[PDB]
Amino acid sequence: EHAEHREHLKHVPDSEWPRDYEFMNIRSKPFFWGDGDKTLFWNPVVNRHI
């Protein structure tokens, strides 16, 4: 059921992702792995904010 809900949440446009709050996903510095604004276990389907 949760995988079905995350597949439903996959087809969400970029203006339809809600208000990321002040405390949410803060970037005090870019990360040194990959390219930047992505953590280790980063799921681009669910965790989209930046």
């Binding site: 208000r19 990321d20 709050y21 002040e22 405390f23």
Partner: protein
Amino acid sequence: SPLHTVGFDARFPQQNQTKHCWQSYVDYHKCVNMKGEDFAPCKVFWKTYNALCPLDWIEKWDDQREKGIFAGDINSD
């Protein structure tokens, strides 16, 4: 006026007033949309959060309310 202020609040008797200022701000914004009939009792919380909160805090909270990012229990209903 010759030297009046908020006074002592029995709900916040300790040293730090950080939730006192926040609760006065949230109750002033909650008196507007919910009740809206008592404009001078609304200004009691206005004078309280004005006397207790820094202006940068009030500016950031006003910006977060206007952009919807504000984390307070504000139900426009």
